[PDB]
Design an enzyme around this catalytic site. Structure first.
Site, mmCIF file in Angstrom:
data_model
loop_
_atom_site.group_PDB
_atom_site.id
_atom_site.type_symbol
_atom_site.label_atom_id
_atom_site.label_comp_id
_atom_site.label_asym_id
_atom_site.label_seq_id
_atom_site.Cartn_x
_atom_site.Cartn_y
_atom_site.Cartn_z
ATOM 1 N N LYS A 10 -5.800 3.883 -10.168
ATOM 2 C CA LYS A 10 -6.773 2.802 -10.073
ATOM 3 C C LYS A 10 -7.633 2.940 -8.812
ATOM 4 O O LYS A 10 -7.260 3.611 -7.847
ATOM 5 C CB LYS A 10 -6.114 1.407 -10.055
ATOM 6 C CG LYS A 10 -5.103 1.207 -8.909
ATOM 7 C CD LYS A 10 -5.725 0.697 -7.616
ATOM 8 C CE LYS A 10 -4.663 0.448 -6.548
ATOM 9 N NZ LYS A 10 -5.188 0.287 -5.147
ATOM 10 N N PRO A 99 -1.751 11.655 -5.696
ATOM 11 C CA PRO A 99 -1.092 11.622 -4.390
ATOM 12 C C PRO A 99 0.014 10.583 -4.359
ATOM 13 O O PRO A 99 -0.042 9.558 -5.046
ATOM 14 C CB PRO A 99 -2.229 11.227 -3.437
ATOM 15 C CG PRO A 99 -3.483 11.590 -4.168
ATOM 16 C CD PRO A 99 -3.172 11.270 -5.593
ATOM 17 N N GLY A 101 0.894 7.767 -2.496
ATOM 18 C CA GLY A 101 0.176 6.882 -1.599
ATOM 19 C C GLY A 101 -1.333 7.026 -1.702
ATOM 20 O O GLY A 101 -1.893 7.607 -2.641
ATOM 21 N N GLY A 106 -0.546 5.245 -7.596
ATOM 22 C CA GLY A 106 0.121 6.195 -8.476
ATOM 23 C C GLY A 106 1.566 5.829 -8.781
ATOM 24 O O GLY A 106 1.993 5.867 -9.933
ATOM 25 N N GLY A 107 2.344 5.513 -7.743
ATOM 26 C CA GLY A 107 3.720 5.092 -7.955
ATOM 27 C C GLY A 107 3.833 3.813 -8.767
ATOM 28 O O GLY A 107 4.741 3.677 -9.598
ATOM 29 N N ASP A 141 0.801 -4.056 -7.068
ATOM 30 C CA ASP A 141 -0.051 -3.123 -7.801
ATOM 31 C C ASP A 141 0.370 -2.954 -9.264
ATOM 32 O O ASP A 141 -0.443 -2.529 -10.097
ATOM 33 C CB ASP A 141 -0.049 -1.739 -7.112
ATOM 34 C CG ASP A 141 -0.416 -1.786 -5.609
ATOM 35 O OD1 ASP A 141 -0.594 -0.695 -5.025
ATOM 36 O OD2 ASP A 141 -0.583 -2.873 -5.000
HETATM 37 N N1 ADP Z 1 6.885 7.859 -8.673
HETATM 38 C C1 ADP Z 1 6.344 7.615 -7.438
HETATM 39 N N2 ADP Z 1 5.143 8.128 -7.047
HETATM 40 C C2 ADP Z 1 4.584 7.879 -5.838
HETATM 41 N N3 ADP Z 1 5.184 7.111 -4.912
HETATM 42 C C3 ADP Z 1 6.388 6.530 -5.159
HETATM 43 C C4 ADP Z 1 7.052 6.753 -6.464
HETATM 44 N N4 ADP Z 1 8.215 6.072 -6.441
HETATM 45 C C5 ADP Z 1 8.299 5.458 -5.231
HETATM 46 N N5 ADP Z 1 7.206 5.732 -4.463
HETATM 47 C C6 ADP Z 1 7.025 5.200 -3.077
HETATM 48 O O1 ADP Z 1 5.774 4.481 -2.871
HETATM 49 C C7 ADP Z 1 4.934 5.097 -1.847
HETATM 50 C C8 ADP Z 1 3.681 5.653 -2.528
HETATM 51 O O2 ADP Z 1 3.355 4.835 -3.676
HETATM 52 P P1 ADP Z 1 1.862 4.734 -4.325
HETATM 53 O O3 ADP Z 1 1.876 3.748 -5.484
HETATM 54 O O4 ADP Z 1 1.417 6.149 -4.596
HETATM 55 O O5 ADP Z 1 1.028 4.005 -3.123
HETATM 56 P P2 ADP Z 1 -0.588 3.825 -2.941
HETATM 57 O O6 ADP Z 1 -1.038 2.462 -3.403
HETATM 58 O O7 ADP Z 1 -0.746 4.015 -1.438
HETATM 59 O O8 ADP Z 1 -1.182 4.890 -3.831
HETATM 60 C C9 ADP Z 1 5.872 6.032 -1.081
HETATM 61 O O9 ADP Z 1 6.312 5.342 0.092
HETATM 62 C C10 ADP Z 1 7.078 6.283 -1.979
HETATM 63 O O10 ADP Z 1 8.293 6.179 -1.235
HETATM 64 N N1 UKO Z 2 -1.775 -8.785 -1.609
HETATM 65 C C1 UKO Z 2 -0.952 -7.958 -0.766
HETATM 66 N N2 UKO Z 2 -0.572 -8.494 0.496
HETATM 67 C C2 UKO Z 2 0.260 -7.615 1.299
HETATM 68 O O1 UKO Z 2 0.611 -8.022 2.339
HETATM 69 N N3 UKO Z 2 0.653 -6.264 0.845
HETATM 70 C C3 UKO Z 2 1.468 -5.470 1.765
HETATM 71 C C4 UKO Z 2 2.860 -5.852 1.742
HETATM 72 C C5 UKO Z 2 3.540 -4.855 0.391
HETATM 73 C C6 UKO Z 2 2.876 -3.570 0.418
HETATM 74 S S1 UKO Z 2 1.447 -3.778 1.380
HETATM 75 C C7 UKO Z 2 0.258 -5.716 -0.435
HETATM 76 C C8 UKO Z 2 -0.586 -6.611 -1.242
HETATM 77 C C9 UKO Z 2 -1.081 -6.156 -2.587
HETATM 78 C C10 UKO Z 2 -1.569 -5.945 -3.607
HETATM 79 C C11 UKO Z 2 -2.216 -5.722 -4.943
HETATM 80 N N4 UKO Z 2 -2.608 -4.339 -5.167
HETATM 81 S S2 UKO Z 2 -3.938 -3.663 -4.312
HETATM 82 O O2 UKO Z 2 -5.061 -4.598 -4.338
HETATM 83 O O3 UKO Z 2 -4.374 -2.445 -4.985
HETATM 84 C C12 UKO Z 2 -3.414 -3.314 -2.614
HETATM 85 C C13 UKO Z 2 -4.571 -3.167 -1.637
HETATM 86 C C14 UKO Z 2 -3.702 -4.436 -1.633
HETATM 87 MG MG MG Z 3 1.187 1.383 -5.534
#
Ligand code: ADP
Ligand code: UKO
Ligand code: MG
Ligand code: MG
EC number: 2.7.1.148
Length: 281
Positions: A10, A99, A101, A106-107, A141
């Protein structure tokens, strides 16, 4: 039989922080769109009740992986309501392009695709709302991916109103830095006061991401990638970073800029999708 399931990225087309609740989470106004680009998840049913992620994700332990957490959450919930056929299990493998993160989700998209696929394959019969409700416990997310439509999102991200933004072409770049999402949201200088506005106001205002100023200031790698792309096209952080996207009207322009990009952009090009490839499938 093995089945394959899309797990798309996304983008936060815009992202405004309106406040912070008592539990530490932030209230927001953001616009999600999917990309027609992401991981592919393959599932083979087991009959012994086990859940096995066969393909490890670097840096993530099996039991910490959102794939496995999502599968076990669905198993527990279905079993506590008598909706889990005896012996329901699964072998799960992932072809990971996204990626770990970076604000592409993605996760969380992996978690959502697993919830949806296993609910279908185990015949748990759970509804969208129940899955989205369980997804939310895995991260803010996750619900947008479970529900499968581009959406104006409020609350912490879970209050979703479907909308159809233009399906532009995007160059998505990943600066060579890892930003723990807790960092941005704990910054003193993060806007937490952006006025809540109507969708009409937001869809007409210039799109920005309230987190970008902080990501840019604190991570020179993010600032470099953003500065480079801004010369070519409107460009902004997605999520809390580190990924940055540039918006284009056509695939050819996006790919031409990509062909030009130094390798430290770590870039890919993909089209916006208002219907998640998962739900298309
Ligand atoms: N299948 C997965 N893919 C990516 N990250 C994962 C997964 N399972 C757990 N994670 C955890 O979540 C973090 C990355 O998640 P991700 O959804 O990719 O974050 P972002 O919103 O930054 O893209 C890492 O800290 C990792 O430990
Ligand atoms: N609303 C929030 N308050 C927070 O404090 N956290 C932190 C505490 C948990 C991980 S980070 C995340 C969110 C969220 C969300 C929805 N997904 S999102 O928009 O793609 C991403 C950009 C924000
Ligand atoms: Mg995520
Ligand atoms: Mg995909």
């Amino acid at each position: 039989m093995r089945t394959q399931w899309p797990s798309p990225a996304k983008l936060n087309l815009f992202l405004y922080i309106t406040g912070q609740r008592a539990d530490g989470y932030h209230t927001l106004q953001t616009l999600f769109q999917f990309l027609d680009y992401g991981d592919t998840i393959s599932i083979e049913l087991r009959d012994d009740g086990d859940i096995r992620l066969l393909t490890p994700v670097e840096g993530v332990e099996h039991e910490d992986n959102l794939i496995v957490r999502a599968a076990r959450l669905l198993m527990k919930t279905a079993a506590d309501s008598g909706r889990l056929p005896t012996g329901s299990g699964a072998n799960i493998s992932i072809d990971k392009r996204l990626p770990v993160g970076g604000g592409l989700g993605g996760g969380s998209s992996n978690a959502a695709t697993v919830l949806v696929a296993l609910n279908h394959l185990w015949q748990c019969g759970l509804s969208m709302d129940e899955l989205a409700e369980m997804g939310l416990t895995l991260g803010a997310d996750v619900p947008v991916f479970v529900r499968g439509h581009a959406a104006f999102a409020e609350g912490v991200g879970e209050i979703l109103t479907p909308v159809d933004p233009p399906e532009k072409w995007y160059l998505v770049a990943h600066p060579g830095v890892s930003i723990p999402t807790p960092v941005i949201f704990k910054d003193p200088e993060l806007p937490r006061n952006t006025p809540k506005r109507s969708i009409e106001t937001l869809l007409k205002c210039e799109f920005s991401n309230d987190c970008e100023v902080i990501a840019r200031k604190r991570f020179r790698e993010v600032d470099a990638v953003l500065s480079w792309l801004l010369e070519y096209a409107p460009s902004r952080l997605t999520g809390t970073g580190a990924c940055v996207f540039a918006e284009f009207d056509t695939e050819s322009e996006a790919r031409q800029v990509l062909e030009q990009a130094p390798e430290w952009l770590n870039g890919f090009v993909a089209k916006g999708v208002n219907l998640s490839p998962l739900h298309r499938a």
